[PDB]
Write a protein that binds this ligand. Structure first.
Ligand SMILES: Cc1cn([C@H]2C[C@H](O)[C@@H](COP(=O)(O)OP(=O)(O)OP(=O)(O)O)O2)c(=O)[nH]c1=O
Ligand SMILES: [Mg+2]
Ligand SMILES: [Mg+2]
Ligand SMILES: [Zn+2]
Lengths: 645, 217, 114
RNA sequence: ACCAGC
């Protein structure tokens, strides 16, 4: 087992130069350094470590280091170099699953961290936590160039090579080894009967928990689909931007003549301030003097202003009744502009040269093992039920990537699971009601007959209502879904509670398992804990933040892992079938939101093979962990991501 | 503008160059130093006469501006005072190139620099004709730009014939090739460069394909 | 750039205040933010006010971000625009009124932009 | 505090 690091010229997008590399060994204990002219010897040492049957340790290796090696081995000295995934291990993957809760333990330590590293899984943060850090590189470099005449306001301190970069690389691999000796010192994930510094690639994975393999495979898959990208249309979204930019310039000239300007107190200094529809304070003052009583006070001195109070509002002047709809439309168009093009993290400022968008996908960002998305966020664009929703999802299509050998568009297949957490709930409480609850779920659609038996107008309101009622609501927040008072909210809870009397029994069992005593305060709550963590489906310690949300962190944390194994198995079957992954192959992963997957492929027969093998992969997921239920998905075929939602 | 800035009154200090790759020994040998006046650290270059008398300063700031201390002479060369003889000189375009060549040769060859640049190089090479007579070979080292080609073409007219040889570089000039690690390819250009051929005259044998091309038109 | 959330002190909320890399905080609930002539005219001396133009239509924030401010000196109304440099300092000014009295104060360069 | 998602 070796521990190595890299230094490059820039990020993974455009990397063209190797600088230095330090390899430390657990068999000879040598700081084997390398040079810019010694990159071939570095690759020979890595291939000798691969061929002997060992493991190579990196930090953020799946996302950054391994494709940088693969690119620099080809574009500098023209030789193929591929690392197997069963030999490369990462320390940033292990930092997220053992220590999955840093924001709830960073206080009391902030005396150590400067403040900018608050809850950071970066290696400099752990160097500050392990108290092994002989200064920084960026700040010392900036201080050196401010000591010299030439200043460097850019902040990309990886152009030239020197010896200080070698010294901080040695410091970086020392910090990496210091993180690895602590992260391997856990007893719940690694059994304390064998040393993990001398085992092969068939022993380190097969003599530990299942959670350490699935997370590294998911990190490999998510780094690969991050490297793949997502096709995007530039002209169709500029047409939308030039469409809805001349709309808010009409909604301000027409509106300020209705709601006039006024003087505001700054001998008494006054100012001539005009109506700003973006502020929620001016609209409140203009609805006070228009003859309206809010009858709703969330704040201690101010009413609430949102979409549900601007619908049931009546004034005497009939012009303001039509103007409030224009105010709501202006706020919607303002949010559309802020999300689409004019935002700091907008769509048009993260488009690559090949017309694609590469988004950061964090595999373990939530406290319940749910993956998050950032820079940009591709899982929060408006749906088809929202206004200007179909015109946005038509641009995020897979038919905008012509093939490089034929010049033809491709076909997008989107596969969603229906009733995931509600079927997992039937899996958990099957030992209480003897398992006659998951049979009605398999008998037709559950949300349709729930809508019929609950007289909700839409299926979406019923799907919102059932997960509102299930995850610990109140008396008014689920009466707010139907718009009635607390009496209907009480009678619907008494209706849906007496149907299946196994939810309260499972809740009482979980409360008897976790908590033992709970002292009550009139303004707080003092809870003496007994077991803070919950064993998951793979022995992972799932953290609990609040005791009345234990059903939440027991349900959705067990629902993400089956999807995380299913997205692995649905390509492990296709690779063994004899297909090819990548843009020059047969299929390519594009987007993985919490429920559905979006794959893009060349011909429709490949989409048929994918939609056939997805059910078999989901069946293997349901069979591998011995589930009492029967899992099922549903797929759609189309040109873009407006039909396949 | 005022006077020659002394290092004592301006808090002079000899340091290295991290962003360009020059240690403090070369700037100690030459006299390119750093003043701390008005808060902002100013870079400043020193000019000397043949005997060693300080005659001119070149003041540059953090934001690429120029400041002359007074009467800038036409025979002002950066590095002329240190060497008074030799068989092979290298004339650099700027001032960091001469320090870069001093770094890669351990202070062996007589290497100087210009005082005007590529704009008024012909006047300062015509006014320094008597200094180049005591030498045996001259290696012109200019930028790989259109202005650099114009300077190496037109400034090589007032020079003595038979002693001018021009080297080529893959970078902009020698300093980025020092930064990109091309320290072996520059020494061959110092030792074996190309003579003063491409002025505009052609050979009788080099046209053999091109006359064919006009024969195929 | 945004980093994370801190509990506010004015509104007293838990996730209302946000911390930035520049050192300033901003709360979303309480809305509190923390941290010729040859003479360039001073802003506070000539009664500088960021008034929004009414007859043609320009918001106040554009006049704040551009530096086009109204002076009320000598009982009249002037519209002073400011020309700056790359360093972030006022280089020159332009004065415009109803009679279009072009009184360009300061060192007006030949390559001045806005 | 608001908006969107699953
Ligand atoms: C809308 C919503 C869904 N969820 C859960 C329910 C699901 O397990 C997952 C995604 O929900 P959905 O995909 O919207 O619902 P579904 O998969 O049960 O049905 P279908 O595919 O036929 O439309 O997230 C919440 O926890 N809170 C929510 O507000
Ligand atoms: Mg690294
Ligand atoms: Mg679904
Ligand atoms: Zn606040």
């Amino acid at each position: 087992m070796i521990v190595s690091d890299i230094e490059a010229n820039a990020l993974l997008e455009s990397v063209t130069k190797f600088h230095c590399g330090v390899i430390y060994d657990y068999s000879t204990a040598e700081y084997v350094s390398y040079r810019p002219s010694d990159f071939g010897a570095y690759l020979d040492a890595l291939e000798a470590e691969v061929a002997r049957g060992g493991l190579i340790v990196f930090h953020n290796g799946h996302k950054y280091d391994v494709p940088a090696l693969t690119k620099l081995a080809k574009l500098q000295l023209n030789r193929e170099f591929h690392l197997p995934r069963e030999n490369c291990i990462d320390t940033l993957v292990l930092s997220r699953l053992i220590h999955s809760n840093l924001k709830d333990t960073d206080m009391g330590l902030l005396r150590k961290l400067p403040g900018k590293r608050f809850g950071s899984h970066a290696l400099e943060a752990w160097g500050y936590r392990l108290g092994e850090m002989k200064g920084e590189y960026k700040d010392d470099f900036k201080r050196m160039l401010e000591e010299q005449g030439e200043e460097y306001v850019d902040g990309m301190e990886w152009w030239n090579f020197n010896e200080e970069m070698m010294d901080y690389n040695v410091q970086d691999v020392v910090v990496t080894k210091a993180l690895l000796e602590k992260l391997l010192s856990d007893k719940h994930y690694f059994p304390p009967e064998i040393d993990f510094t001398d085992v092969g690639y068939t022993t380190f994975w097969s003599e530990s928990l299942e959670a350490v393999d699935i997370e590294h495979r998911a990190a490999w898959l998510l780094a690969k689909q991050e490297r793949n990208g997502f096709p995007f249309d530039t002209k169709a979204i500029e047409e939308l931007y030039v469409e809805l930019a001349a709309r808010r310039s009409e909604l301000l000239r027409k509106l300020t003549e209705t709601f006039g300007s006024w003087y505001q107190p700054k001998y008494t200094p006054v100012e001539h301030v005009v109506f700003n529809p973006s502020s929620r304070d001016h609209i409140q003052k203009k609805l006070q003097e228009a003859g309206w009583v809010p009858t709703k006070y969330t704040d201690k001195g101010a009413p609430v202003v949102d979409d549900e109070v601007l619908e049931g509002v009546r004034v005497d002047d009939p012009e303001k009744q039509a103007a409030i709809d224009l105010i709501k439309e202006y706020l919607m168009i303002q949010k559309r502009i802020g999300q689409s093009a004019e935002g700091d993290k907008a769509w048009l400022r993260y488009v690559a040269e090949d017309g694609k968008i590469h988004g950061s996908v964090n595999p373990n960002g939530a406290v319940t093992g749910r993956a998050t998305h950032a820079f940009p966020n591709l899982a929060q664009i408006p749906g088809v039920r929202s206004p200007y929703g179909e015109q946005c999802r038509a641009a995020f299509g897979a038919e905008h990537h012509l093939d490089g050998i034929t010049g033809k568009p491709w076909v997008q297949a989107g596969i969603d699971a229906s009733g995931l957490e509600l079927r997992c709930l039937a899996h958990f409480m099957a030992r209480f009601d003897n398992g006659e609850y998951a049979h009605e779920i398999l008998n037709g659609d559950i949300h349709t007959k729930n809508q019929i038996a609950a007289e909700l107008p839409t299926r979406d309101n019923a799907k919102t209502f059932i997960y509102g009622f299930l995850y610990g609501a109140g008396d008014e927040k689920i009466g707010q879904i139907v718009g009635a008072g607390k009496e209907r909210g009480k009678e619907l809870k008494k209706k849906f509670l007496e149907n299946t009397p196994a939810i309260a029994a499972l809740r009482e069992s979980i409360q008897q398992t976790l908590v033992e005593s709970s002292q009550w305060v009139a303004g707080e709550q003092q809870v003496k804990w007994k077991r803070r963590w919950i064993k998951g489906l793979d022995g992972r310690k799932v953290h609990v933040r609040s005791p009345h949300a234990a059903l939440n962190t027991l349900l959705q944390s067990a629902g993400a892992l089956i999807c995380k194994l299913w997205i692995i198995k649905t390509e492990e079957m296709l690779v063994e079938k004899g297909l090819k992954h990548g843009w020059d192959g047969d299929f390519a992963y594009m987007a993985w939101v919490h429920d559905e997957i979006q794959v893009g492929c060349r011909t429709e027969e490949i989409a048929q093979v994918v939609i056939e093998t997805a059910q078999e992969a989901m069946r293997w997921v349901g069979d591998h962990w011995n589930f009492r239920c029967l899992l099922d998905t549903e797929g759609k075929m189309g040109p873009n991501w407006a039909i396949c939602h | 503008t005022y006077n020659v800035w002394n290092f004592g009154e301006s808090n002079g200090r000899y340091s290295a160059l991290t962003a360009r790759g020059i240690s403090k020994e070369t700037c100690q040998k030459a006299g390119y130093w750093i003043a701390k006046v008005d808060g902002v650290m100013y870079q400043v270059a020193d000019y000397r006469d043949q005997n060693g008398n300080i005659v001119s300063q070149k003041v540059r700031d953090k934001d690429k501006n120029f400041k002359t201390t007074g009467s800038h002479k036409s025979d002002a060369l950066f590095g002329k005072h240190l060497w008074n003889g030799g068989k092979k000189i290298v004339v650099t375009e700027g001032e960091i190139d001469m320090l870069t060549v001093m770094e890669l040769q351990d202070c062996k060859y007589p290497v100087v620099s210009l005082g005007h640049g590529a704009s008024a190089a012909k006047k300062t090479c015509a006014a320094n004709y008597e200094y180049f007579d005591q030498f045996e070979q001259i290696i012109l080292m200019f930028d790989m730009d259109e202005a650099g080609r114009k300077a190496v073409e037109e400034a090589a007219q007032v020079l003595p014939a038979g002693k001018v040889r021009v080297a080529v570089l893959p970078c902009k000039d020698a300093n980025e090739c020092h930064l990109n690690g091309h320290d072996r390819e520059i020494m061959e250009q110092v030792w074996n460069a190309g003579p003063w051929i491409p002025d505009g005259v052609v050979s009788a044998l080099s046209l053999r394909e091109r006359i064919r091309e006009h024969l195929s038109s | 750039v945004f980093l994370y959330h801190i509990p506010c002190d004015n509104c007293g909320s838990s996730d209302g205040n946000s911390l930035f890399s520049d050192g300033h905080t901003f709360c979303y609930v309480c809305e509190k933010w923390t941290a010729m002539t040859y003479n360039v005219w001073n802003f506070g001396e000539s009664n500088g006010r960021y008034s929004a133009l009414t007859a043609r239509g320009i918001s106040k924030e554009t006049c704040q971000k551009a530096g086009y401010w109204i002076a009320k000196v000598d009982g009249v109304m002037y519209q002073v625009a400011d020309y700056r440099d790359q360093n972030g300092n006022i280089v020159s000014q332009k004065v415009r009124d109803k009679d279009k009295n072009f009184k360009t104060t300061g060192s007006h360069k030949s390559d001045a932009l806005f």
